[PDB]
Amino acid sequence: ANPLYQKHIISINDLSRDDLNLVLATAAKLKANPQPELLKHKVIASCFFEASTRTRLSFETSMHRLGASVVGFSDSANTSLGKKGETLADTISVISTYVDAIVMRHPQEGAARLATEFSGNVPVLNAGDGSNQHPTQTLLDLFTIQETQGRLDNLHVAMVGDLKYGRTVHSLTQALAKFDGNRFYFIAPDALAMPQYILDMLDEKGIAWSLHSSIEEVMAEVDILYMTRVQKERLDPSEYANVKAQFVLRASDLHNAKANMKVLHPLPRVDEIATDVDKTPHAWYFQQAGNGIFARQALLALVLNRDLVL
Amino acid sequence: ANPLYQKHIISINDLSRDDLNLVLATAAKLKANPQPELLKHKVIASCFFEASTRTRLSFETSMHRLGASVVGFSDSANTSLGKKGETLADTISVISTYVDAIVMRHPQEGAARLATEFSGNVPVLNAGDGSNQHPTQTLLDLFTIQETQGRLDNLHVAMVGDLKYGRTVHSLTQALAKFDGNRFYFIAPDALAMPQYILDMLDEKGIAWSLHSSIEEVMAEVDILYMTRVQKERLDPSEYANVKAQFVLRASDLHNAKANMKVLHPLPRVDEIATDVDKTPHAWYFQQAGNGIFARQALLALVLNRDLVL
Amino acid sequence: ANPLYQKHIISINDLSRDDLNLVLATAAKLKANPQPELLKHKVIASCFFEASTRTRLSFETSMHRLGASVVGFSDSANTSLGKKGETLADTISVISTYVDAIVMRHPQEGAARLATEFSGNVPVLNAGDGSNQHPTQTLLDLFTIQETQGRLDNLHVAMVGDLKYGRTVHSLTQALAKFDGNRFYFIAPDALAMPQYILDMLDEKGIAWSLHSSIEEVMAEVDILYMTRVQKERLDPSEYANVKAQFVLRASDLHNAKANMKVLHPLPRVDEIATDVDKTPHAWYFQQAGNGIFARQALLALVLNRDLVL
Amino acid sequence: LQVEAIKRGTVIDHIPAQIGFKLLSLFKLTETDQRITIGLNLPSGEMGRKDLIKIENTFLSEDQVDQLALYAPQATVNRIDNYEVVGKSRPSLPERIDNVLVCPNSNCISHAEPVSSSFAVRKRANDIALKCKYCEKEFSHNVVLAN
Amino acid sequence: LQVEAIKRGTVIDHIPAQIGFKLLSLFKLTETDQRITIGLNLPSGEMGRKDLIKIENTFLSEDQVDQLALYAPQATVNRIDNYEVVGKSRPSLPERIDNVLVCPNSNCISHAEPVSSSFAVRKRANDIALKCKYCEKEFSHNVVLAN
Ligand SMILES: Nc1ccn([C@@H]2O[C@H](COP(=O)(O)OP(=O)(O)OP(=O)(O)O)[C@@H](O)[C@H]2O)c(=O)n1
Ligand SMILES: Nc1ccn([C@@H]2O[C@H](COP(=O)(O)OP(=O)(O)OP(=O)(O)O)[C@@H](O)[C@H]2O)c(=O)n1
Ligand SMILES: O=c1ccn([C@@H]2O[C@H](COP(=O)(O)OP(=O)(O)OP(=O)(O)O)[C@@H](O)[C@H]2O)c(=O)[nH]1
Ligand SMILES: O=c1ccn([C@@H]2O[C@H](COP(=O)(O)OP(=O)(O)OP(=O)(O)O)[C@@H](O)[C@H]2O)c(=O)[nH]1
Ligand SMILES: O=C(O)C[C@H](NC(=O)CP(=O)(O)O)C(=O)O
Ligand SMILES: O=C(O)C[C@H](NC(=O)CP(=O)(O)O)C(=O)O
Ligand SMILES: O=C(O)C[C@H](NC(=O)CP(=O)(O)O)C(=O)O
Ligand SMILES: [Mg+2]
Ligand SMILES: [Mg+2]
Ligand SMILES: [Zn+2]
Ligand SMILES: [Zn+2]
């Protein structure tokens, strides 16, 4: 079987470079040549305990494109966990008797990891756990970088905004650090800096990173400009001075960008990317979102099938 | 056609022993040999006006396993009944022009019965109506007892907790009373006793039942120990002294149980079953839940198909 | 100085029979011969941190009938304790630099006692502290019992309703127990029984008391029928079965009542005394309430004025 | 002896078994720089098994000795000086217990406010009843927890 | 020797001051009938002051010994039989610590749910890093020890 068959997908920290390349190669194949019946007779749970537009809808669309069925919920309010006091543990214990895989997003860090301890042989795919990890976002992010840059090595990547609570950049930084010669630029308010456990990992691997107080400092040298939203639903009230976006990208700020540079954003944006950026050739956040379909089909196919031959 | 073809499934009181055995026999067949296209081209409404995890998800998973499509809602808040003042009657009147069967759970006793009066030729399956009936729970309960005990006759069954509001034990007691020589033990607070209409039925049939103030009194003789949750969303405020579980099963309490005894619970549990019970060979509430798939597939297959040949 | 001069008045348990008699003697005197200027140049705080009609309004009226001025609040919501997070300790520490006495009611037991530890030389008068004590209620009650029965000894006294949370009957039972040969009947639901510390006190003093499940049992021998409201704002949710009055006195219940028997109630009543009782000669709860003026005038005179009124 | 003699301080002898640790925890006796020697589950001819606490250069007033009465009513408190027992006393039931206990009435003012806990102590039947200075409710000592 | 030698059991030596009493709590060491002797604030050659705990006929569980590495890295665990030291070692840092610690991340799922805590352990030269199995956040052991 392929290395990802029947594996839980919880944290980028558990995945190798080869694992990531496998998903990306499989994504490119499915995009080029769809497999409408690959997951026929599979039923998959989509269990979202906090809000989502892109992650839930692309995941479910992906399941349907491969011929699987879907059950689940987008709100926990009408589950027995919402109304009758049921633990997450018991919730996972019963749902895992119904379905072939569980896709879950949850407001508490570690929820996906905990689910794996109650799901027996049923693989759990982490659609986001609090401010911790967001593996499938990273998969589609990598895919999009690979598509536009032709490579995952020797890139200049800037990450902007809320890096402390951005589960997107935690997963993405760890993934890009598995490749060679990547250089990182962290542009964030002090209160929302990239956490030390990320930085230490970069140091241990001899990867160059630096802090900057403006996009302008690095605009001329970046291949990927990854913008993020302030995670206000995660902020401690003591951090409320940081609610408004501190860095606001406008079309005029792109004047000295490399022609090949792409602006990414896992979305949704509030104000950190002005709408006049949308029509520039650098805007690629909607194309990025669209790539969620191919990454997530790829992941589903690899976890629920022993072998794929194109 | 089979006796259950196109029948409403509202109350165990309307079903015979033969009906119950038919579902159980059909459940065993489907578990052994799945029929992925049995309900192809059927569309089924899953209409939940109160919370559910197991009943809704297993029902919908069951529909997909047989190849049917599903529409419905898990919250009534965004139906026209929730926002525009529409009656349940009218709601059933229109939905029954769309679908081949209606699965419904509702906080008011009698709602499922009322639905049958507006659904014309469309069968209604009661997923729970207030504290009244819960037929499909009983179907999976019987299936699980049959599997573990080898029989539905001459059993010693203990039911513990909120028997007044437990729609699960109302349906289950009526079903087991259709079989021979079963003996019942009711362990409940006085305020939440098994209702008199149940007891009278047991008396009319010459079935032995008795009340007990502890599990310990009966542990050594029970084949099935059926635990229940206090139905706090049903309690009158005058009954609030009974909110906490009065009977708490722990691993240590099982020391004198029959080796073959199984602990069941329709779920969710709050505290009435401690987690140290989960690893004992007597814990069977998760296996029980899993059996909801086969009972509910069986029921759907029998209601929507004239004939099944294995 | 008189024995009560500058004394805190917190609990009947701290007062002797002589103290009680002194208040009543003083009350009789001021009623016969008002002293409108006795407390001229006093300023007294009326500090109510939970609801009151009778206690606050009669205390304040008494202050004015004696020539004193009044400051305070009837709601804590707009004090700095209510809005700025101030402790009760600091509230008392500042108010006691302003006034000559503090009258306080509070929803926590022990609040008045606490106030005395921060009020320096300024007397605290407990107008009710949670379900604990209500000494000035007891003073007016004793005055009323004495008025209508001619004595405070050798009486048959029934107390009905919520005895567990009635600060009224805690104080009154302790007071009457300081007189000789009184006999008590306690008519309460088991969940709201008279507290053990009261009963132990009766037993040490050799005082006869008994429990009864109906008013009718004792109607023929009671001199004082002391009715109480169920203290719903003090009930645990687990005691919500007792919210509704379990004993409802109506005019027809009074047929075999002694001619001298008075019905008392510290008020407010809900339904425990039907309005048809109001016009019978046994109804004395409004007269009782009016006696609060004489008792509270007396107490203020004794606490704030060195000499005995004559 | 397994726990050697001291030059100066207090020796609490004849502590019932399982109480020695409770005393150290409750009265914060280890919150000092003075040398402490403790024996637990020691044999006794008088009690069978016993605990023993020695605290050097530290002395206990009659009141402090009395606070022990609730846990070790038949303990012996030895005042040691120049290796010599210069005083022996036994705990007497105190009039009150302050600071260390918490009132079990959840609506008591003592929980919200900067005051020290305080309970009056009395013998009731064969039990010890504690009456809170603030709320005036009375409890069996068994249900009155420590901080 | 204020606290004398024992026949068979365990002697935990070189426990830093104000830690010995904490060990008696955490490891429920006094919840036994076995004879126990404790020296607190004893003079020490290498430490100046120390605490010392002796438990007869009793040995520590594994990882309870590696819990010791967190609370008292410099402590010496002596295994004693027939009045002789036969096992002598200092507890080394384990990779993993389960059950006893609390994740300081308040939004960690480990608080709300019935699982056992679990941390991976590594040294950063000036403190110890504890990494939560669940939330994947890393903390100084100084911060985790505020359970
Ligand atoms: N320098 C000293 C002297 C006395 N002790 C202790 O003080 C306690 C009691 O002193 P002592 O009167 O000498 O012993 P007993 O006669 O047995 O006293 P009692 O009869 O009350 O038990 C004993 O535990 C003893 O070890 C001590 O620790 N250090
Ligand atoms: N039968 C024994 C033997 C030794 N000890 C204690 O065990 C500890 C260590 O044993 P030992 O090697 O004899 O002492 P040291 O040589 O000083 O060891 P270290 O180098 O660790 O200080 C000492 O505190 C000693 O009192 C004991 O209580 N009972
Ligand atoms: O200071 C002491 C006292 C006693 N012990 C130890 O406790 C045990 C008793 O030694 P003791 O001599 O002190 O007890 P006892 O005969 O006086 O009898 P009681 O008054 O306690 O009823 C012995 O095992 C001894 O080693 C000490 O180690 N140190
Ligand atoms: O078993 C023991 C060990 C030690 N002690 C007491 O501890 C003190 C130290 O005596 P030690 O002999 O144990 O210290 P040390 O020379 O071994 O030097 P370190 O290992 O501590 O660095 C002495 O005061 C002694 O009374 C005991 O009472 N009992
Ligand atoms: O919310 C963000 O800002 C980034 C990221 N966003 C998404 O995954 C997109 P969505 O919330 O619509 O599924 C996330 O962590 O949830
Ligand atoms: O809720 C219970 O305690 C028992 C019973 N439970 C169920 O049916 C399981 P669920 O509510 O998750 O569908 C019910 O009557 O709803
Ligand atoms: O509230 C009661 O039922 C009795 C008693 N009532 C009064 O004091 C009358 P009031 O609340 O109007 O001042 C009390 O304890 O507050
Ligand atoms: Mg002795
Ligand atoms: Mg040494
Ligand atoms: Zn109190
Ligand atoms: Zn954590």
Relative to the alpha carbon of E115, which ligand is closest?
Answer: 11
Q: Rounded to the nearest whole angstrom, what is the distance from the C-alpha of residue D7 to the centroid of ligand 8?
A: 18
Question: Between D4, D18, D34, which is nearest E41 by CB?
Answer: D34
The β-bridge relationship of strands B124-129 and B156-160 is: unpaired
Is the Cα torsion angle B226, B228, B234, B237 positive or negative in sign? positive
State the catalytic residue, choosing from B8, B29, B55, B262: B55
Collapsing DSSP to helix, strand or coil, B239 comes out as helix
**Rounded to the nearest 5°, which phi and psi values hold at C219?**
-55, -40
Specify whether B54 is catalytic: yes
Give which of A102, A92, A113, A117 is closest to B54, Cα–Cα: A92
Question: In Å, how far is B92's CA from the nearest CA of chain A?
Answer: 21
What residue's CA is closest to ligand 1, atom 16? D85
How far apart (Å, rounded) are the C-alpha atoms in residues C32 and C29?
A: 5
Is B258 one of the catalytic residues? no
Structure token digits, residue C10: 């917190």
Q: Is B85 exposed, middle or buried (0-12, 13-18, 19+ CB in 10 A)?
A: exposed
> Would you state the structure tokens that stand for residue B43, as one six-digit string?
């569309």
Is the Cβ–Cβ distance between B184 and B221 less than 8 Å?
Answer: no
Which residues form the pocket of ligand 2, taking CB atoms under 6 Å from any ligand atom?
E 5-6, 11, 13, 54, 76, 78, 80, 83, 85
- E56 and E99 in a single domain? The answer is no
Q: Return the ligand number nearest the Cα of D85.
A: 1
At E132 the three-state DSSP class reads strand
Q: Which residues contact E65 (CB under 8 A, 6 or more apart)?
A: E77, E91
Ligand 1 nearest-atom number relative to CA D4: 28
d(CA A180, CA E71): 40
Chains in contact with A, where contact requires at least 3 CB pairs less than 8 Å apart: B, E
Distance CA A31, CA B132 (A): 52
Which is catalytic among the residues B7, B42, B65, B105? B105
Q: What is the distance between the alpha carbons of residues A224 and A228, in angstroms, rounded to a whole number?
A: 13
Question: Do D117 and D89 fall into the same domain?
Answer: no
Do E11 and E53 form a contact (C-beta atoms < 8 A)? yes
Whether chain B lies against chain C with 3 or more Cβ pairs closer than 8 A is yes
Q: Which of C31, C54, C113, C212 is catalytic?
A: C54
Calculate Rg over the CA atoms of chain B.
19
A104 close to A127: Cβ distance less than 8 angstroms: yes
Each domain of chain B, given as residue ranges in start order, spans 1-133+292-310, 134-291
- Report how far residue A107's alpha carbon sits from residue A48's, in angstroms, rounded to the nearest whole number: 9
With CB atoms and an 8 Å threshold, state whether E134 touches A13. no
Beta carbons of D5 and D13 less than 8 angstroms apart? no
Q: One of C7, C29, C42, C105 is an active-site residue; which one?
A: C105
User: Which method resolved this structure?
Assistant: X-ray
Phi-psi region of E56 (alpha: psi -120 to 50; beta: other; left: phi over 0): beta
| CATH number of the domain residue E124 falls in | 2.30.30.20
Class (C level, CATH) for C1-133+292-310: alpha beta
* Beta-bridge partner residues of C43: C69
Distance, in Å, from the CA atom of D47 to the CA atom of A241, rounded to the nearest integer, reads: 66
- B65: nearest CB among A43, A83, A85: A43
D135/C89 CB distance under 8 A: no
Distance between Cα E56 and ligand 9 center (Å): 19
Q: Is residue C54 among the annotated active site residues?
A: yes
Chain E residue closest to D1 (CA)?
Answer: E4
Distance CA C270, CA C245 (A): 8
Buried b (16+ CB within 10 A) or exposed e, B128-151: bbbbbbbbbbbbbbbbbbbbbbee
DSSP single-letter state for residue C179: S
Contact B164, B192 (CB under 8 A): yes
Going by alpha carbons, the residue nearest to atom 23 of ligand 2 is E13
**C308, C5 Cβ separation under 8 angstroms:** no
Dist. CA C118–CA C93, nearest whole Å: 5
At how many Å resolution was this determined? Answer: 2.2
Contact in structure between C171 and C138 (CB atoms under 8 Å): yes
Task: Count how many residues are written for chain A.
Answer: 310
* Containing structural domain, residue D119: 95-147
Nearest to A89 among E113, E135, E137 (CB): E113
Give the span between the Cα atoms of B167 and B165, in whole angstroms: 6
Distance E141 CA to ligand 9 centre (A): 28
Taking CA atoms, A299 is separated from A70, A140, A149, A152, A304, in Å, by 16, 10, 22, 19, 9
Q: Report how far apart, in Å, the C-alpha atoms of B134 and of each of B11, B112, B131, B224, D71 are.
A: 7, 10, 9, 19, 56
8-state DSSP, B25: H
Given a contact cutoff of 8 angstroms between Cβ atoms, the answer to whether A94 and B54 are in contact is: yes
- Please, which residues bridge with residue C109 across strands? D108
Burial of residue B62 (CB within 10 Å: 0-12, 13-18, 19+) is buried
For residue C199, give both structure tokens: 């009963």
Rounded CA separation D25/D146 (Å): 10
A115 interfaces chain E, CB cutoff of 8 Å: no
A 139-158 → E contacts, CB under 8 A: none
Min Cα–Cα distance to chain E from D112, Å: 23
Looking up residue D16, the CATH number of its domain turns out to be: 3.30.70.140
| Residue with CA nearest ligand 3 atom 29 | D3
Residue A118 tokens read as 């109650």
Whether residue E11 is found in the same domain as residue E62: yes
d(CA D74, CA D81): 23
**Minimum-distance ligand 3 atom for the alpha carbon of D5:** 1
Assess contact for E107 and A236: CB atoms under 8 A.
Answer: no
Ligand 3 lined by D48 (C-beta under 6 Å): no
CA distances from C73 to C44, C61, C100, C108, C289 (A): 12, 15, 16, 17, 22
The three-state DSSP-derived secondary structure of E98-131 is ECCCCCCCCCECCCCCCCCCEEEEEECCCCEEEE
Sign (positive or negative) of CA dihedral C171, C176, C177, C178: positive
The continuous run of DSSP H or E covering E21 comes out as helix E20-26
Q: Which atom of ligand 5 is nearest to the CA of A228?
A: 3
D107: nearest CB among C13, C109, C200: C109
Q: Tally C-beta pairs within 8 A across B and C.
A: 17
CB atoms within 10 A of CB C124: 27
State the burial class of residue A259 (Cβ atoms within 10 Å of its Cβ: 0-12, 13-18, 19+).
Answer: exposed
Q: Rounded distance, CA A143 to CA A295, Å?
A: 7
Any bridge partners for residue B159, and if so which?
B186, B226
Distance E58 CA to ligand 9 centre (A): 21
Q: Could you identify the residue written with the tokens 């039925």?
A: B201
Q: What is the rounded distance in angstroms from the CA atom of residue C136 to the CA atom of residue C6?
A: 16
Same domain as D82, residue D24: yes
CB E39 near ligand 4, within 6 Å: yes
B169: tokens are 């034990």
Fold match between C1-133+292-310 and C134-291?
yes
Q: Do A114 and E113 touch (CB under 8 A)?
A: yes
The kind and range of the H/E element at C116 are helix C111-116
Residue given tokens 């379990």 in the structure block: C246
CB interface of D with E, residues 24-43, below 8 Å: 24-25, 30, 32-42
| Number of C-beta neighbours around residue A37 at 10 A | 10
The answer to whether chain C touches chain A by having 3 or more C-beta pairs less than 8 angstroms apart is no
The structure tokens listed for B294 are 């086969």
**Closest ligand by atom to D6 CA:** 1
Strands B101-106 and B43-48: parallel
Bridge-based pairing of strands C224-227 and C156-160 is parallel
Going by C-alpha positions, the residue among B126, B114, B10, B106 that lies closest to residue B49 is B106
- Maximum CA extent, chain A: 57
- Single out the residue of C127, C247, C177 nearest to residue C17, CA to CA: C177
D58: contact with E, CB 8 A cutoff: no
Query: Do E14 and E73 fall within a single domain?
Result: yes
List of chain C residues whose C-beta atoms are within 8 Å of the C-beta of residue B238: 240-241, 243
**What's the number of domains chain D is made of?**
2
Q: What would the two tokens of residue D100 be?
A: 């260390």
E88 and E19 in a common domain: yes
Residues with CB under 6 A from ligand 5: A 52-56, 128, 134, 137, 167-168, 229, 266-267
Helix (H, G, I), strand (E, B) or coil at D100: coil
Q: In terms of Cα–Cα distance, which of B4, B1, B6, B167 is closest to B102? A: B6
Return the closest-CA partner of residue A262 out of A163, A151, A162.
A151
DSSP C256: T
d(CA C235, CA C230): 9
Please say which residue of E78, E94, E110 terminates a domain.
E94
**CATH of segment(s) B134-291:** 3.40.50.1370
Burial A158-176 (b: 16+ CB within 10 A, else e): bbbbbbbbbbbbbbbbbbb
Residues near ligand 1 with C-beta < 6 Å? D 1, 5-6, 11, 13, 54, 76, 78, 80, 83, 85, 88
Q: Which of A41, A45, A80 comes nearest B268 by C-beta?
A: A80
Are the C-beta atoms of D85 and D52 separated by less than 8 Å?
A: no
Is C203's Cβ below 8 Å from some Cβ in D? Answer: no
Residues D17 and D54 in one domain: yes
> Could you tell me if A121 lies within 8 Å of chain B, comparing CB atoms?
no
Q: In this structure, what token pair is assigned to residue A183?
A: 């250089």
3-state secondary structure chain A: CCCCCCCCECCHHHCCHHHHHHHHHHHHHHHHCCCCCCCCCCEEEEEECCCCCHHHHHHHHHHHHCCCEEEEECCCCCCHHHHCCCCHHHHHHHHCCCCCEEEEEECCECHHHHHHCCCCCCCEEEEEECCCCCHHHHHHHHHHHHHHHCCCCCCEEEEECCCCCCHHHHHHHHHHCCCCCCEEEEECCHHHCCCHHHHHHHHHCCCCEEECCCCHHHHCCCCEEEECCCCCCCCCHHHHHHCCCCCCECHHHHCCCCCCCEEECCCCCCCCECHHHCCCCCECHHHHHHCHHHHHHHHHHHHHCCCCCC
Q: How would you classify residue C41: left for phi > 0, otherwise alpha for psi between -120 and 50, otherwise beta?
A: left
If asked whether residues D24 and D77 sit together in one domain, one would say yes
Residue located nearest, by CA, to atom 8 of ligand 6 = B55
Encoded amino acid at B161, one letter: G
How close does chain C come to D139, measured CA to CA in Å?
9
Q: In angstroms, what CA-CA distances link A228 with A12, A188, A219?
A: 19, 10, 16
- Phi, psi torsion values for D79, nearest 5 degrees: -90, 115
Which residues of chain A make contact with B143, given a CB cutoff of 8 A?
A: none
Q: Which of C288, C224, C226 is nearest to C261 (CA)?
A: C224
Q: Which of D1, D33, D40 sits opposite E41 (nearest CB)?
A: D33
Residue D13: other Cβ atoms inside 10 A: 20
For residue C219, how many other CB atoms are within 10 A of its CB?
18
Please give the Cα distance from A240 to A237 (Å, whole number).
Answer: 5
Pair E72, E17 in one domain: yes
Strands (E) in chain C, as ranges, are 43-48, 69-73, 101-106, 124-129, 156-160, 183-187, 209-211, 224-227, 262-264
Q: How far apart are CA C230 and CA A12, in angstroms?
A: 61
CB-neighbour burial class of residue A81 (10 A; exposed 0-12, middle 13-18, buried 19+): buried
Q: How far is E123 from chain D (nearest CA, A)?
A: 30
DSSP state of D109: G
